[PDB]
């Protein structure tokens with residue numbers, strides 16, 4: 001198992017506490033510098049957009065065609081669909097969607113699907129940013145695995161729509177879907193890179209500590225390097 005050694009070697013460069021989890025539908029595997037992160041709960045931050053889009057489309061609070069118009073209050077200073085907002089990571093668009101859903105519906109939907117600790121507190125548009133909603137990397141990886149397979153408790157066409165919002169690139173006929181996250185409001189700060197590769201499916205979740213001034217592109221660069229070494233997503 002020199003593949004594992006090659007992966008671990010990648011993390012010898014990274015000074016931050018990091019775990020990388022993979023899920024192929026049967027096996028959970030863990031790599032990185034602090035493996036206990038995989039079973040620790042952190043705020044989902046921008047990764048919550050996935051569940052937010054799902055709940056919203058499911059409950060007729062938006063469509064994938066609808067334009068969320070900018071209200072003129074100051075980057076993200078333009079009109080976005082939910083898909084455009086996903087890849088741009090436009091928080092205010094998804095805050096608006098959260099406010100359309102409302103605390104009662106949000107709470108019951110998170111409970112219904114068993115997302116993380118299923119806690120929203122009192123602010124319906126901040127709970128994934130400041131807490132108290134938390135989720136383990138293992139939970140995230142299983143979540144996005146089911147999304148890829150269309151086996152979440154949502155309408156099939158809803159899952160397909162949200163799934164394709166996460167599309168990043170393809171190599172041959174292998175497809176990468178991914179969503180990054182950087183929770184700055186919490187201490188310590190958490191970084192996410194969650195997604196999956198469609199050949200069979202391999203879901204993955206990078207989860208690591210972040211500090212002000214860190215390289216924003218590190219999460220993706222690291223994950224792609226890991227996926228290549230695993231042979232899950234080879235470089236072209």
Ligand SMILES: *C(=O)[C@H]([C@@H](C)O)[C@@]1(C)CC(S[C@@H]2CN[C@H](C(=O)N(C)C)C2)=C(C(=O)O)N1
Nearest residue numbers: 045046047089091129180181182183184216
């Ligand atoms: C969600 O993960 C996060 C939300 C909480 O803003 C988000 C969208 C911010 C970033 S980093 C982005 C790059 N430059 C900006 C900045 O320096 N600030 C503080 C305005 C923020 C990410 C990310 O995943 O990189 N996600």
